[PDB]
Amino acid sequence: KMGLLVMAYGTPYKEEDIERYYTHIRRGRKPEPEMLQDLKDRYEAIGGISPLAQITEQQAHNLEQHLNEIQDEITFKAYIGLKHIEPFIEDAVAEMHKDGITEAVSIVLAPHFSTFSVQSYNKRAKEEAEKLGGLTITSVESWYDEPKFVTYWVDRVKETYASMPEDERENAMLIVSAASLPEKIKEFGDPYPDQLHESAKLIAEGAGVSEYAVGWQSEGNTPDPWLGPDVQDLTRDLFEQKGYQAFVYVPVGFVADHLEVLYDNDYECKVVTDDIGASYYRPEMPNAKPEFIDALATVVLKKLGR
Ligand SMILES: CCc1c2[nH]c(c1C)/C=c1\[nH]/c(c(CCC(=O)O)c1C)=C\c1[nH]c(c(C)c1CCC(=O)O)/C=c1/c(CC)c(C)/c(n1C)=C/2
Numbered sequence: 041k042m043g044l045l046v047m048a049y050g051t052p053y054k055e056e057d058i059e060r061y062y063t064h065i066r067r068g069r070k071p072e073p074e075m076l077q078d079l080k081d082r083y084e085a086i087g088g089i090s091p092l093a094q095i096t097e098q099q100a101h102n103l104e105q106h107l108n109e110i111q112d113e114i115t116f117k118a119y120i121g122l123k124h125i126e127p128f129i130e131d132a133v134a135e136m137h138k139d140g141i142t143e144a145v146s147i148v149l150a151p152h153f154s155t156f157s158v159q160s161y162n163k164r165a166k167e168e169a170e171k172l173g174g175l176t177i178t179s180v181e182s183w184y185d186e187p188k189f190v191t192y193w194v195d196r197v198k199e200t201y202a203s204m205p206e207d208e209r210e211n212a213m214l215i216v217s218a219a220s221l222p223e224k225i226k227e228f229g230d231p232y233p234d235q236l237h238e239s240a241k242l243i244a245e246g247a248g249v250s251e252y253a254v255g256w257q258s259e260g261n262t263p264d265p266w267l268g269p270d271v272q273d274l275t276r277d278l279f280e281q282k283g284y285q286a287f288v289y290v291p292v293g294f295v296a297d298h299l300e301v302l303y304d305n306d307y308e309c310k311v312v313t314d315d316i317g318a319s320y321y322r323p324e325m326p327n328a329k330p331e332f333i334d335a336l337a338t339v340v341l342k343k344l345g346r
Pocket residue numbers: 049062065066067079156157219220221222258259260261262299300
């Protein structure tokens with residue numbers, strides 16, 4: 041019986057939880073009334089918060105079921121650990137420990153390694169396990185290069201391009217993005233930026249797309265600079281330089297239909313394309329599709345040498 045610790049940033053399960061989620065992200069400070077209202081507005085804008093938290097649940101559940109289905113050596117038990125939403129990462133480890141689990145494999149629902157989004161989760165998780173004792177966690181650190189994951193996006197892209205009208209297919213620009221982070225991660229030699237660039241190349245060459253670019257999105261609002269250029273500005277600058285008739289957005293850094301994709305892409309990036317008279321394209325996110333789950337299953341099994 042092995043533990044399967046699945047971690048992610050987290051999304052509120054109920055609208056009544058939006059505020060605390062914000063506080064947690066703001067590290068103890070409740071958001072300003074307007075600031076809070078502006079987040080609530082965005083969730084409504086995309087159809088409600090309700091569906092979002094369910095996707096992460098289905099991903100972990102399906103991953104557990106598939107891993108236990110494709111091989112008979114190990115029986116996995118999934119535990120969700122989130123950064124800003126209960127069950128928190130430390131709560132999930134505590135529960136694995138309480139349940140008697142002595143060995144566990146963890147994986148973050150973000151393909152690129154970064155200090156802020158993968159290393160900090162693994163660290164928090166392992167430190168809690170050590171404090172409890174008798175629980176050893178083996179952590180997946182990056183999987184953006186897993187061929188089945190790359191293939192997933194390559195196929196979604198080939199399809200989008202093959203469904204475009206003639207004019208666009210010859211004047212389209214592919215934008216591969218991930219969640220931006222403070223530039224100070226460089227102080228730690230964080231390869232996050234490099235992994236994104238490689239992720240973009242792998243997908244572009246796989247789909248046979250030659251015109252593509254790398255951008256960042258969803259940066260937080262702090263006094264420090266964040267990884268740029270932002271997808272919105274990148275789209276404008278690229279249009280100004282070649283007048284592309286279409287932009288295809290691949291938020292490879294994200295795995296589900298969350299706020300960053302449904303809003304920051306489907307709304308804010310479409311605002312830019314609409315403004316410049318270009319079509320907007322954004323292939324389906326992995327969510328809990330079997331093709332994606334099989335990719336994660338292979339990633340976990342490989343980490344275990346199986
Ligand atoms: C899911 C994509 C993502 C998000 N944040 C990070 C990532 C990887 C990382 C991060 N977001 C960050 C940080 C910490 C930056 C730091 O250490 O200063 C990381 C690693 C926080 C941040 N994020 C935001 C703010 C305003 C801040 C600063 C909070 C403060 O006032 O202290 C904004 C959000 C929000 C809405 C609350 C979301 C959903 C969110 N951030 C941008 C997205």
